[PDB]
Enzyme design. Structure first.
Site, mmCIF file in Angstrom:
data_model
loop_
_atom_site.group_PDB
_atom_site.id
_atom_site.type_symbol
_atom_site.label_atom_id
_atom_site.label_comp_id
_atom_site.label_asym_id
_atom_site.label_seq_id
_atom_site.Cartn_x
_atom_site.Cartn_y
_atom_site.Cartn_z
ATOM 1 N N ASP A 193 37.790 80.594 -55.350
ATOM 2 C CA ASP A 193 37.160 79.341 -55.859
ATOM 3 C C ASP A 193 36.348 79.630 -57.124
ATOM 4 O O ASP A 193 35.219 79.165 -57.303
ATOM 5 C CB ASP A 193 36.321 78.651 -54.765
ATOM 6 C CG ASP A 193 35.897 77.202 -55.128
ATOM 7 O OD1 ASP A 193 36.555 76.561 -55.987
ATOM 8 O OD2 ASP A 193 34.901 76.712 -54.531
ATOM 9 N N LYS A 195 35.427 78.911 -60.471
ATOM 10 C CA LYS A 195 35.363 77.735 -61.326
ATOM 11 C C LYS A 195 33.976 77.657 -61.902
ATOM 12 O O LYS A 195 33.034 78.185 -61.275
ATOM 13 C CB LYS A 195 35.702 76.467 -60.526
ATOM 14 C CG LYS A 195 34.784 76.141 -59.349
ATOM 15 C CD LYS A 195 35.261 74.883 -58.635
ATOM 16 C CE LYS A 195 34.330 74.563 -57.493
ATOM 17 N NZ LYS A 195 34.699 73.344 -56.722
ATOM 18 N N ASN A 198 30.608 77.327 -59.898
ATOM 19 C CA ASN A 198 30.167 78.483 -59.117
ATOM 20 C C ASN A 198 29.792 79.722 -59.976
ATOM 21 O O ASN A 198 29.523 80.765 -59.429
ATOM 22 C CB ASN A 198 31.253 78.845 -58.095
ATOM 23 C CG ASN A 198 31.527 77.742 -57.087
ATOM 24 O OD1 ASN A 198 30.695 76.901 -56.807
ATOM 25 N ND2 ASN A 198 32.715 77.770 -56.513
ATOM 26 N N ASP A 211 28.626 80.519 -54.233
ATOM 27 C CA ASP A 211 29.505 79.831 -53.278
ATOM 28 C C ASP A 211 30.606 80.769 -52.763
ATOM 29 O O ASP A 211 31.782 80.667 -53.139
ATOM 30 C CB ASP A 211 30.081 78.536 -53.869
ATOM 31 C CG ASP A 211 30.648 77.593 -52.802
ATOM 32 O OD1 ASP A 211 30.535 77.850 -51.557
ATOM 33 O OD2 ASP A 211 31.210 76.562 -53.240
ATOM 34 N N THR A 230 38.873 70.831 -54.805
ATOM 35 C CA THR A 230 39.434 70.286 -56.046
ATOM 36 C C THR A 230 40.412 71.273 -56.727
ATOM 37 O O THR A 230 40.121 72.479 -56.856
ATOM 38 C CB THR A 230 38.349 69.837 -57.053
ATOM 39 O OG1 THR A 230 37.443 70.917 -57.317
ATOM 40 C CG2 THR A 230 37.584 68.643 -56.508
HETATM 41 O O1 LIG Z 1 27.128 77.073 -52.698
HETATM 42 C C1 LIG Z 1 27.314 76.213 -53.556
HETATM 43 C C2 LIG Z 1 27.187 76.636 -54.998
HETATM 44 C C3 LIG Z 1 25.906 76.048 -55.538
HETATM 45 C C4 LIG Z 1 24.889 76.915 -55.962
HETATM 46 C C5 LIG Z 1 23.646 76.415 -56.434
HETATM 47 C C6 LIG Z 1 22.573 77.331 -56.913
HETATM 48 C C7 LIG Z 1 21.824 77.010 -58.058
HETATM 49 C C8 LIG Z 1 20.839 77.876 -58.517
HETATM 50 N N1 LIG Z 1 20.583 79.013 -57.918
HETATM 51 C C9 LIG Z 1 21.246 79.392 -56.838
HETATM 52 N N2 LIG Z 1 21.148 80.505 -56.068
HETATM 53 C C10 LIG Z 1 22.037 80.406 -55.058
HETATM 54 C C11 LIG Z 1 22.739 79.284 -55.124
HETATM 55 C C12 LIG Z 1 22.261 78.569 -56.288
HETATM 56 C C13 LIG Z 1 23.476 75.024 -56.493
HETATM 57 C C14 LIG Z 1 24.493 74.197 -56.075
HETATM 58 C C15 LIG Z 1 25.717 74.678 -55.578
HETATM 59 C C16 LIG Z 1 26.700 73.607 -55.167
HETATM 60 C C17 LIG Z 1 27.808 73.889 -54.176
HETATM 61 N N3 LIG Z 1 27.576 74.965 -53.233
HETATM 62 C C18 LIG Z 1 27.675 74.557 -51.887
HETATM 63 C C19 LIG Z 1 28.808 74.788 -51.097
HETATM 64 C C20 LIG Z 1 28.852 74.350 -49.773
HETATM 65 C C21 LIG Z 1 27.772 73.662 -49.231
HETATM 66 C C22 LIG Z 1 26.645 73.415 -50.018
HETATM 67 C C23 LIG Z 1 26.599 73.858 -51.334
#
Ligand SMILES: O=C1Cc2cc(-c3ccnc4[nH]ccc34)ccc2CCN1c1ccccc1
Ligand SMILES: O=C1Cc2cc(-c3ccnc4[nH]ccc34)ccc2CCN1c1ccccc1
Lengths: 388, 373
Positions: A193, A195, A198, A211, A230
């Site tokens: 994944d 992209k 991530n 992720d 996606t």
């Molecule tokens: O795991 C993710 C990736 C991720 C990472 C961060 C992030 C931003 C800044 N510092 C960080 N440190 C660790 C993660 C992180 C913010 C948003 C998303 C959106 C999607 N997602 C996801 C997948 C499944 C369920 C819930 C969410």
């Protein structure tokens, strides 16, 4: 020796990778008490007496162990499969972290309730600057929690929308993605994944992958046996395997690097269409459908690199290891070497006004029923708790 | 960090319900209670068992078990099990090992008596209490590995010797200190009788069978207050010391009778029915001491602590003081032919849970039993 059998046993429990470490054993006890403490089930004297014995001490453990109330939720910074990522401040230490929540109910209900193990393990144990670090994992009756280093730079989606991205910058982020993926691949794992969503930027503008919820462990042949969100970044072998029972390996990540570099330099996805079905059809027809637009500002070497990744798996770049990728002439530059790229000045060093500045991120239940008999809804999560 | 310090401190404590051994019991017992083909129709249970199958099998192999000990002889039988003389195979060391049937305890036991039995022998650190070295379990039985007492019981002693007053003085004094030590831990024995008084290799006494202990806040030896209650305190043990001393010096029980109902009736009528037979030559002080224990609970000797017992003139002698009795020469020094000589013990003659359809938790009452010294 009897002493040697006790030496061996203690060695298993001291090991932080072990399934029967102390935290896992405590999860064992907590999860058991959660699954049993329901007035109907307490008609069984075995269960009732056991709960009476362990009432005090479990309340005492619950209080002392790390929990959601230890953190102030500042802002939700992203949504995903089984929950969300929230920007949090640890109350006592005043330190900021990203905290990912996953709904136990939704995972049990949608039946996708073992991806989190590898997600936790990779972030906990990589000890790599390309992988987001896990500091703590904990759990309550409703959610799993992963406390991770906060990446205030935002993602590459955010970067692409705010900067027309020159080739010199594209070269930098791609190179960091390559090393990132090689680090993951050398741990025996595939991301599946890759992209821009991530790919996250730290306080100094350097990349880390995030992720790890579609991570599979590779076998001794380099391959793995499940679903997808996606389609834009997914390789054609991954699309055929979903319908059939085909295998794929690390090469699926290298496809995505090709797609990434096309996105960065052109401004669009290589197999863009309005529907998902359009995209899927274009990806399967990549031999014909891949087309560089005549107005795109792109070098011959950058076209050659993208074209080397966006082929059928058997002739694709990154089968024979990362060295052939690294030596590609596209990567020739005055600014950095492969051994030092992450300690050079990044293209865009984020300017942040406080420790909760999330300005590089865009702005943004139901429980188990009271069961009639023992169901063991907490049993899949025994071992999740990790205190670094 | 202070919360993590506190939590780790609970786990290091061997008295804690969440020590490592208890936590391992927790995991073992959970796997035993879940691993049945019917229950594995639940995916939660099936997947959990798949995750922990290997490592639990590996733990079970490492942990102490019945197969580590060679059964020499069964040296005793009781309520929900038996006591066997065993040799630990690897160390070659001899122990007395008590087995207790989990099924029979679940089926017939109204209380979890084994907790206090285990705790007393584990944690008394008294030469008057039989020491427990290990406690462990399998799916069928609890096991308590204790010091072997090759000298036999006081029943065995009384049947093989006419006991003179000098000897009776010695054994009674050792019973006193033994009970005082138990009472100082906050516990009542409730089953003080010569069967439960054992002699070590040196002919010195220790108490045993702590399966009827309650924590304070056969009918020959039972006190009258215990009979009417079917609340009471430590003085019920002190009754039995009176009975013990009468038995040793006379050669019969003070309230002997043909039926049980006769015995019970004589015990209730102890003010009249206690009577020293005229041909048994007992001293005035020995009569005085027996009479002081064999009274109504409210005026009984041992109500106001051990001190009135210790100063009783009966115990005056040239051989030993209260502070050094256990360091003096025992009356009967055991004559033992080997480390498995059980010649001071009489020879002895000779079902499970059903496979459940759903979760019953038959192993749950025994989580925490394991103790390794
Ligand atoms: O795991 C993710 C990736 C991720 C990472 C961060 C992030 C931003 C800044 N510092 C960080 N440190 C660790 C993660 C992180 C913010 C948003 C998303 C959106 C999607 N997602 C996801 C997948 C499944 C369920 C819930 C969410
Ligand atoms: O607990 C006992 C006391 C006991 C102790 C010993 C013994 C002999 C030599 N050394 C020893 N060291 C420790 C005990 C011991 C031998 C036999 C009995 C018979 C009854 N009983 C009982 C009660 C309930 C269930 C099962 C058994």
């Amino acid at each position: 020796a009897g002493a040697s059998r006790q030496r061996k046993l203690e060695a298993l429990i001291r090991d932080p990778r072990s399934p029967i470490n102390v935290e896992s054993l405590l999860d064992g006890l907590n999860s058991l008490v959660l699954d049993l403490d329901f007035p109907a089930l307490r008609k069984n004297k075995n269960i009732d007496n056991f709960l009476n014995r362990y009432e005090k001490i479990v309340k005492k453990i619950r209080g002392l162990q790390m929990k959601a109330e230890d953190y102030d939720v500042v802002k939700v910074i992203g949504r995903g499969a089984f929950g969300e990522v929230q920007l949090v401040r640890h109350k006592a230490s005043q330190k900021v972290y990203a905290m990912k929540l996953l709904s136990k109910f939704e995972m049990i209900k949608r039946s996708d309730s073992a991806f989190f193990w590898e997600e936790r393990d990779i972030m906990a144990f990589a000890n790599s600057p390309w992988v987001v670090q896990l500091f703590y994992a904990f759990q309550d009756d409703r959610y799993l929690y992963m406390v991770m280093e906060y990446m205030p730079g935002g993602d590459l989606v955010n970067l692409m929308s705010n900067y027309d991205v020159p080739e010199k910058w594209a070269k930098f982020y791609t190179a960091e993605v390559v090393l990132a993926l090689d680090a993951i691949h050398s741990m025996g794992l595939i991301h599946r994944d890759v992209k821009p969503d991530n790919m996250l930027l730290d306080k100094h503008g350097h990349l880390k992958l995030a992720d790890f919820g579609t991570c599979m462990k590779m076998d001794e042949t380099g391959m793995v046996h499940t679903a997808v969100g996606t389609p834009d970044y997914i390789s054609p072998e991954v699309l055929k395997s979903q319908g059939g029972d085909g295998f794929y390996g690390r090469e699926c990540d290298w496809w995505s690097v090709g797609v990434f570099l096309y996105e960065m330099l052109v401004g669009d996805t290589p197999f863009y269409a309005d529907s998902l079905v359009g995209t899927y059809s274009k990806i399967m027809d990549h031999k014909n459908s891949l087309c560089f637009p005549e107005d795109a500002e792109i070098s011959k070497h950058a076209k050659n690199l993208i074209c080397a990744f966006l082929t059928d798996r058997e002739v694709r770049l990154g089968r024979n290891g990362v060295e052939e990728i690294r030596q590609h002439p596209f990567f020739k530059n005055d600014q950095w070497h492969w051994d030092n790229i992450r300690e050079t000045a990044a293209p865009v060093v984020p300017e942040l006004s406080s420790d909760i500045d999330s300005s590089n991120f865009d702005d943004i239940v139901e429980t188990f029923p009271i069961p009639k008999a023992f169901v063991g809804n907490q049993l899949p999560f025994i071992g999740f708790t990790y205190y670094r």
